[PDB]
């Protein structure tokens, strides 16, 4: 996270760290949606241009964390993956359209003060909150700068941007399964996700029922926190039918 701040303890209890077993490293962010399911970006698990194709045994899920590098004894929970499900129409060849994947854990994780699931939006949630100007929150242990690494989880609040502005900021083809967020050059404020944060959640707190909903997934961007560029996010509600199908079947 570039231009963000240190998260408070228990501020994002659904935060998940995808950790590579060997070599030991941060692979991506992710989120806890039930005691057995974790949501992330498809590109965190499959991206042929870079010969990335992780299988279940290649990584671990670390939940309840705050410190990036420390093994948080008596606090974090480490979980193994039973199966990975990547959206069948994920477009890694072109623009990362439908950048979403689910991971089923081998065993349910116990909830605690530091581990708790985030809600997924329904049609009404999306219509109510996904409006230009409304701010969401992104969290992660990724890079602090485009060109080090944080001691603890970082957080930044960012406004959703009008679709025409998002479209005009890039040569990449944008789809209805994406939205973009971030401040414009004339707004003065800054902030963006960066390497290490993708797959992580973009959440919003409903002012109607005071619950947090994951509206997006950190998907892509050109550089990090560059003026005139915006971060792009997978539109969770638009892909919810797929999410439900997978959980209902498996």
């Amino acid at each position: 996270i570039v231009e963000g701040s240190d998260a408070e303890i228990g501020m994002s209890p659904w935060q998940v760290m995808l950790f590579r077993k060997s070599p030991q490293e941060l692979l991506c962010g992710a989120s806890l949606i039930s005691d057995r399911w974790v949501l992330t970006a498809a590109h965190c698990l499959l991206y042929p241009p870079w010969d990335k194709n992780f299988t279940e045994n290649d990584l671990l899920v670390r939940i309840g964390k705050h410190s990036r590098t420390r093994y948080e004894r008596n606090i974090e929970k480490i979980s193994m993956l039973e199966k990975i499900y990547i959206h069948p129409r994920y477009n890694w060849r072109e623009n990362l359209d439908r950048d979403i994947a689910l991971m089923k854990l081998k065993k349910p994780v116990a909830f605690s003060d530091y581990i708790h699931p985030v809600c997924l939006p329904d049609r009404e949630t999306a219509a109510s909150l996904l409006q230009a100007g409304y701010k969401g929150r992104v969290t992660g242990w990724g890079n602090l700068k485009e060109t080090g690494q944080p001691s603890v989880l970082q957080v930044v609040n960012l406004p959703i941007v009008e679709r025409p502005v998002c479209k005009d900021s890039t040569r990449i083809r944008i789809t209805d399964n994406m939205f973009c967020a971030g401040y414009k050059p004339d707004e003065g404020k800054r902030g963006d996700a960066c390497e290490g944060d993708s797959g992580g959640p973009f959440v919003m707190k409903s002012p109607f029922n005071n619950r947090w909903y994951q509206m997006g997934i950190v998907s892509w961007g050109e550089g990090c926190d560059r003026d005139g560029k915006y971060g792009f996010y997978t539109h969770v509600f638009r892909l919810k039918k797929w999410i439900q199908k997978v959980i209902d079947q498996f």
Binding site: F19, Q24, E25, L60, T69, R70, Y71, I78
Partner: peptide
């Protein structure tokens, strides 16, 4: 990264 169990 600190070693895990």
């Amino acid at each position: 990264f600190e070693e895990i169990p």
